[PDB]
A and B are shown apart, each in its own frame.
With several copies, the nearest count.
Chain A
Amino acid sequence: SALHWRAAGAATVLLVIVLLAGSYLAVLAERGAPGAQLITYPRALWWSVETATTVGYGDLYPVTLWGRCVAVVVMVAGITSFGLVTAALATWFVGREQERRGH
């Protein structure tokens, strides 16, 4: 349909891809760092969701420079995707409100 609604899905399909690639690179980067906990895929994937939503529970986090890096890409894509739906939900509501004014 429209741009706003397209981007939303795109951000969704992109968020998932980033979640998957993120959890994978997360483990790749953290293993080798003594005391690191973000080192197995299943929980790394969970950590990923935790990060994209900024729900921060502090149960798992990167302790390496590259992990931190991977983390920043995930927070950004997370905050952006979720901020891209909010913006799409605003357009949807703005256009409908326009219709309810014979404008």
Chain B
Amino acid sequence: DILLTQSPAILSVSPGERVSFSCRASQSIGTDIHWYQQRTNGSPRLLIKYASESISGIPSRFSGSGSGTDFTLSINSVESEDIANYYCQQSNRWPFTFGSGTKLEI
């Protein structure tokens, strides 16, 4: 099964800076990588689908890039609302899988 790796686990940053979360697939999965946001006592929220494609209702500061086995979710100038845990998920081959997730800290 496809292993998804999120390093580092925690990630700091100064208010308003640019931040990038990394998710490495254990093998080439194209662009079939999706991103979720999860706040304290919250359900996951889709942020990016298929690596690049943005979702409706999601701030424009969120972007995602990548293909193959390396993907990155970025945030232009993080705000406090962005503090949460971010997960990646693949859908390239069955079964779907999730990254260990990364925590943002301002």
Contacts and interface: CB of A to CB of B under 8 A. Distances in A.
Does A touch B (CB under 8 Å) in the complex? yes
Contacts of A63: 30
Contacts of B52: 34
B91 A37 contact: no
A40 B31 contact: no
B contacts with A: majority SS? loop
Interface string B69-94: 00000000000000000000001111
Majority DSSP secondary structure for residues of A touching B: loop
A77 interface: no
Interface of B: 1, 30-31, 51-52, 65-68, 91-95
A32 interface: yes
B67 A34 contact: yes
Query: How large, as a class, is the contact surface on chain A?
Result: 10 to 19
Nearest to B65: A34
Contacts of B1: 34-35
A30 interface: yes
Contacts of A13: none
16 contacts: A31-B94, A32-B94, A34-B1, A34-B51, A34-B65, A34-B66, A34-B67, A35-B1, A35-B67, A35-B93, A35-B94, A36-B94, A37-B92, A39-B93, A39-B94, A40-B91
Interface string A33-56: 111110110000000000000000
Nearest to A59: B30
Given A34-B31, A39-B93, 15 more contacts: A30-B94, A31-B94, A33-B31, A34-B52, A34-B67, A34-B94, A34-B95, A35-B1, A35-B31, A35-B93, A35-B94, A36-B94, A39-B94, A40-B91, A63-B30
